[PDB]
From a paper:
Voltage-gated sodium channels (NaVs) selectively permit diffusion of sodium ions across the cell membrane and, in excitable cells, are responsible for propagating action potentials. [name].8, one of the three tetrodotoxin-resistant NaVs, is distinguished from other isoforms by the relatively depolarized voltage-dependency of activation and inactivation, slower inactivation kinetics, and an increased persistent current; These attributes make [name].8 principally responsible for inward currents during the rising phase of the action potential, and contribute to hyperexcitability and repetitive firing in the dorsal root ganglion (DRG) neurons where it is primarily localized. Multiple studies have linked [name].8 to nociception and chronic pain. Here, we used mammalian HEK293 cells to express full-length human [name].8 and determined the structure, with and without [name] bound, by single-particle cryoEM.
[name] was isolated from the venom of the Peruvian green velvet tarantula ([name]) and is a gating-modifier peptide that shifts the voltage-dependence of activation to more depolarized potentials. Processing of the data produced a map with an overall resolution of 2.8 Å from 267,708 particles. Density for [name] is clearly visible in the refined map; consistent with its electrophysiological effects as a gating modifier and previous structure-activity relationship studies, [name] binds to the S3-S4 linker on VSDII. [name] is partly buried in the detergent micelle (that mimics the membrane lipid bilayer). The membrane-embedded W27 sidechain partially inserts in the cleft formed by the S1/S2 and S3/S4 segments adjacent to I702 on S2 and G745 on S3, while the V29 sidechain is positioned directly on top of the S3 helix at V746/A747, likely hindering movement of this segment during activation. Comparing the two structures shows that the binding of the toxin induces an inward movement of the top of the S3 helix together with a corresponding movement of the S3-S4 linker towards the pore domain. This redirection of the S3-S4 linker due to [name] binding propagates along its length such that G750 and S751 now sit directly atop S4 and adjacent to the pore domain, potentially hindering translocation of S4. The higher resolution of this map, likely enabled by the stabilizing effect of [name], allowed an additional extracellular loop (ECLI, D280-P295) to be traced in the hNaV1.8-[name] map that was not possible for apo-hNaV1.8. Despite high local resolution, we do not observe any density for [name] above VSDIV in the hNaV1.8-[name] structure, noting that the S1-S2 and S3-S4 linker regions on VSDIV are poorly conserved between hNaV1.7 and hNaV1.8.
Numbering used by the authors:
A (entry chain B): 1 to 35
B (entry chain A): 232 to 407, 651 to 895, 1136 to 1726
The structure:
Amino acid sequence: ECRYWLGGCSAGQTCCKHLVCSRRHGWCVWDGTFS
Amino acid sequence: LKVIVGALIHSVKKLADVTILTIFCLSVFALVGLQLFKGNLKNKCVKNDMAVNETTNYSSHRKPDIYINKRGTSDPLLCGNGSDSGHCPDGYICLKTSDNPDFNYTSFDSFAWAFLSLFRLMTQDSWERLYQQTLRTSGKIYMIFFVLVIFLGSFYLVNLILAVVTMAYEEQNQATWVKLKTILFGLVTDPFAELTITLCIVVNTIFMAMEHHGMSPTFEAMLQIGNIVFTIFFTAEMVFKIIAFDPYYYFQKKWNIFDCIIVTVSLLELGVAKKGSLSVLRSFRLLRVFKLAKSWPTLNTLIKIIGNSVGALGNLTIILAIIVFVFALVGKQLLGENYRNNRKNISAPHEDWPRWHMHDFFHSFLIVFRILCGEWIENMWACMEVGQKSICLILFLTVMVLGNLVVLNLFIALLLNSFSADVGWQVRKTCYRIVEHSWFESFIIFMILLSSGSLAFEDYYLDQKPTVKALLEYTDRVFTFIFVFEMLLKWVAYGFKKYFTNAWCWLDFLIVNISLISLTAKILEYSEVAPIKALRTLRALRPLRALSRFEGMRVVVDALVGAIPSIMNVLLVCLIFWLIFSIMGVNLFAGKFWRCINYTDGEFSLVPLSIVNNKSDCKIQNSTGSFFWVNVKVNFDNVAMGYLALLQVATFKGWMDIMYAAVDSREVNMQPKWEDNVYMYLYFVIFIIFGGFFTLNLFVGVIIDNFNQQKKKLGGQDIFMTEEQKKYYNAMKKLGSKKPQKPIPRPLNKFQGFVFDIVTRQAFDITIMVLICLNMITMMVETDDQSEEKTKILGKINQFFVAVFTGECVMKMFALRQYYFTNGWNVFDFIVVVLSIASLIFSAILKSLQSYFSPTLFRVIRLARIGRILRLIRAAKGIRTLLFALMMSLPALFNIGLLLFLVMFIYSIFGMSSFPHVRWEAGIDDMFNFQTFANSMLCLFQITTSAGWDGLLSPILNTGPPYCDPNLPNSNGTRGDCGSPAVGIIFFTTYIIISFLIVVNMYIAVILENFN
Ligand SMILES: *[C@@H]1O[C@H](CO)[C@@H](O[C@@H]2O[C@H](CO)[C@@H](O[C@@H]3O[C@H](CO)[C@@H](O)[C@H](O)[C@@H]3O)[C@H](O)[C@H]2NC(C)=O)[C@H](O)[C@H]1NC(C)=O
Ligand SMILES: *[C@@H]1O[C@H](CO)[C@@H](O[C@@H]2O[C@H](CO)[C@@H](O[C@@H]3O[C@H](CO)[C@@H](O)[C@H](O)[C@@H]3O)[C@H](O)[C@H]2NC(C)=O)[C@H](O)[C@H]1NC(C)=O
Ligand SMILES: *[C@@H]1O[C@H](CO)[C@@H](O[C@@H]2O[C@H](CO)[C@@H](O[C@@H]3O[C@H](CO)[C@@H](O)[C@H](O)[C@@H]3O)[C@H](O)[C@H]2NC(C)=O)[C@H](O)[C@H]1NC(C)=O
Ligand SMILES: CCCCCCCCCCCCCCCCCCOC[C@@H](O)COP(=O)(O)OCC[N+](C)(C)C
Ligand SMILES: CC(C)CCC[C@@H](C)[C@H]1CC[C@H]2[C@@H]3CC=C4C[C@@H](O)CC[C@]4(C)[C@H]3CC[C@]12C
Ligand SMILES: CC(C)CCC[C@@H](C)[C@H]1CC[C@H]2[C@@H]3CC=C4C[C@@H](O)CC[C@]4(C)[C@H]3CC[C@]12C
Ligand SMILES: CC(C)CCC[C@@H](C)[C@H]1CC[C@H]2[C@@H]3CC=C4C[C@@H](O)CC[C@]4(C)[C@H]3CC[C@]12C
Ligand SMILES: CC(C)CCC[C@@H](C)[C@H]1CC[C@H]2[C@@H]3CC=C4C[C@@H](O)CC[C@]4(C)[C@H]3CC[C@]12C
């Protein structure tokens, strides 16, 4: 939860700011803005 | 300041002669355009009250101008009364209005307007628009003016400017720890070591090339696991080479630090970034193609080209960028407020803003980039409409003049600092003598030239000409039979091996084969099947026999074939450098082009965002059966469609239509919004800089050095010239080398005594020159909306000048006794003073109303005063020398021009049959189509300069409604009026490339004939 530019996630939670989890492999990234 | 003054005078001096010639030829052709074309741009299809009215129907007449806009645009339809002009639709009449097209800026009605039109024709800036308007109004047969002013002036004068820049540079150059066991265990270097890495890069780039809009989720999963596997492979290779190599030695080298950056990006994006317009970082893996440069000398040459641009020649590539940015700053600060305030005047009917503005600093940079790319007239029209016209005029031309020269100057500098450093035997002999006779060569050439011309008549109207069909059908049958018998005669005479080891008799073996299978299929069954139709479409390449039977054609084709390996190498390196941008653009814009529109009257309206936002919105708002979810015809949806889009962006045709869809694209299945992704313009600016400048520089340099190698190997000028043509070239050189002249025996007798002296005077010749000057300005000040009082004065002054010229000619004939006829330029003066006399007399005779006297014939006859100003060539030594160089090149120019005309003819006969029933959409008009040979030649002459090929291909790209109509009642042939996508793509792409090649051939020929 809330892993900034680490490519973590892989769980049932999201990440806080400018961060959403991905499809296929489950990682949350800085999609909203620059990392 | 004397140093900079000297620098300026030298910089103008190198271009002084070429600039004077440019202004002189442009002024002369401006006069020609003014005289032949004037007011015909004011020819709108003004409607008449066709239905009768009980009371007067002209009660007000304040707003009776019921124009009819051209289908697919918001511009009135132009017309002309001539038989070869554009004709009004039923219920309308062609009338002289008071407004010229393009915001009343595009016209031939005055000297300044004609000069601007001819300058735009020189720069080729959307010249096909002035050309289509002029042939809509004046007539098709006026295409000859545009051919003259394109081949000359534009082509020749760009050759002269490019050669002047090249000569100036060349002049400038002439002036110039148990882990150590695991560490050595590495041994990365091995058989197939770096070649297992090269293969991995090749397979990975091939994977990336298989991404598209309509990909199955399984296909996308398979394409992502492959990328994951290759990221693992590259990370492995990196760490296994880190441990094997020393900690400093590995990172000491840039070719390993490049892979470091690539792999760290591949790690820091594939899991630390999403594809929210950030798929470009997913496309950073394509940059690994640089590894193949070691095994690829041309790829290494391109890399060195880019490096020299950023390295030693950075001094001139920093000048390019800084002048672009300064132009952007000044333009924004001067015109952004006007662009914002008056955007209503220059916007599309449904947009609050124009596509190309100077409001921001990004958009001003973008218009400067477009100017340097060579599109300034339209933006100048908009910029003159909104902002101050004088300020707008200064900026757009200054950026076009300074910006284009420095691009060419850096192009040339990069081109030298990166490239220059029994009874059977009796019958056999009988056939030998028959086929080697002098009446069997001229007969075969005549037959070939009558099989060529016979193809031009098989058009759409051939159905309307019934007897012509049978005539052509039996002139083709007999011609093919005679060609087959001539081939059999050659087979009997010579040997099969002698036949089969030639580079030309094979070409004609193939033409005979295709014609003979076509006729055999027609005689036999299956004549109506699609393969047989495909075989019969190939009859357009029959004119290739004239390529073999003419010595100049043979020479030019052999010269271009000598450079085939260089051409193929540059094609391969360009293709793959463009593959990177194809895949990058596909990842950026794959499937994001589609949109909803409203199809009302053949006019497509983009549904506004308030009512439609989605593919599903557009369908839930489909009350009227006129909402259409359609894709932009040139899209980044596949690798192939991506490359047709890259070619359009590089050729600068179809450029805006792609730049708009890409920028406005928001997401997939979601309606485009105005400038939602406004920074995809940066992407296009990077694929044009790189895949345009650098690949073109590489191609040029490679072709030049191949042709220079052949020239130095032969040590002879006959690269494109012939033997008899070389003798004629020697004759012309002798004419030029005629420096000494025999002084004329002065007439001792009183008659002619002082007359000869007063004629041969410097005062006399300067007086004649200045008189020619006033006369030039006199025909220069001639406007369309002129009083009859003004026309009478102009005619009176023309008569006076003709009388003075005739007096001078007779005075020279009298005082100088046949030595007047001795001199060639004196002969030219005599013929141009006997043509002026004849034109004046003919005008007077026709004015007496002997018969119908069309004003266009008066205009044509009045062109005979062109000699009175063409006589000024002598006054300018530089103009005389450049014209002499042109005349020198005319042998080779004629050879390559005849090759180009042959390719034009072949592609014309292709288009006449593959594309007669395609609907008039954007560049295809009732006039500029492929239904008759003259129209096909108009289109092909237009696209030989690659102008408007997007406009002529977009109707081909249509595959269904609302853009076209499968199952149209008439024109049932080509599936109604929808074009064949693949056939049109092949046609237009191959034609523009093949003629880009042949035009480069003419360019290098003229330049190398100017060097000598
Ligand atoms: C940009 O577009 C605007 C609006 O389309 C144009 O404004 C129009 O300007 C003309 C010429 O000045 C005005 O006509 C004149 O207006 C007044 C009476 O209103 C009077 O001087 C004259 O009798 C004449 O009719 C016109 O009214 C005006 N229209 C509007 C809606 O404001 C403007 O000229 C364009 N400007 C540029 C720089 O592109
Ligand atoms: C484009 O996207 C989707 C279809 O892909 C459209 O979804 C629709 O969105 C509207 C507006 O958000 C939803 O209306 C909703 O109604 C009630 C009361 O107003 C309330 O739940 C929400 O506040 C909202 O207004 C509508 O249900 C929804 N339709 C669906 C989910 O089937 C969307 O409108 C399209 N356009 C835009 C501009 O988003
Ligand atoms: C809104 O409704 C109209 C009216 O039905 C839809 O127009 C229809 O569009 C489809 C798909 O473009 C057309 O079908 C195709 O047409 C031709 C043969 O006519 C051929 O290319 C294909 O095999 C296919 O059948 C259909 O003809 C066309 N009908 C009319 C009357 O224009 C429109 O697509 C709807 N809009 C949206 C956004 O769904
Ligand atoms: C306008 C663009 C297209 C122009 C070309 C279109 C027509 C193609 C033919 C053009 C004629 C010139 C092409 C070749 C010129 C190079 C010179 C002639 O090429 C000779 C080749 O045909 C055979 O090559 P070799 O002699 O190495 O091998 C001989 C092997 N056998 C045959 C003895 C067994
Ligand atoms: C805005 C973003 C996308 C631009 C970032 C630059 C990316 C796209 C790439 C494009 C070409 C690349 C360059 C290609 C080659 C070299 C030479 C090498 O010796 C050092 C790295 C360097 C100089 C690279 C740096 C990164 C680079 C400039
Ligand atoms: C999708 C792409 C990148 C993968 C396939 C491209 C292949 C065919 C390309 C990539 C590099 C190219 C090679 C690079 C260098 C040379 C050296 C030259 O003297 C002969 C051709 C040859 C050997 C090229 C042949 C074609 C080639 C192997
Ligand atoms: C010898 C002098 C006059 C220079 C020669 C160039 C001449 C022909 C140029 C310079 C300026 C031009 C004029 C400038 C402005 C106009 C107003 C226009 O509505 C009618 C034409 C007219 C009158 C132009 C006609 C051609 C012109 C007079
Ligand atoms: C042997 C070397 C040093 C000679 C180099 C100087 C000459 C031959 C070079 C320098 C610039 C070159 C030109 C650069 C631009 C073009 C336009 C292009 O579309 C075709 C080639 C062409 C027409 C080149 C012809 C040859 C050229 C003029």
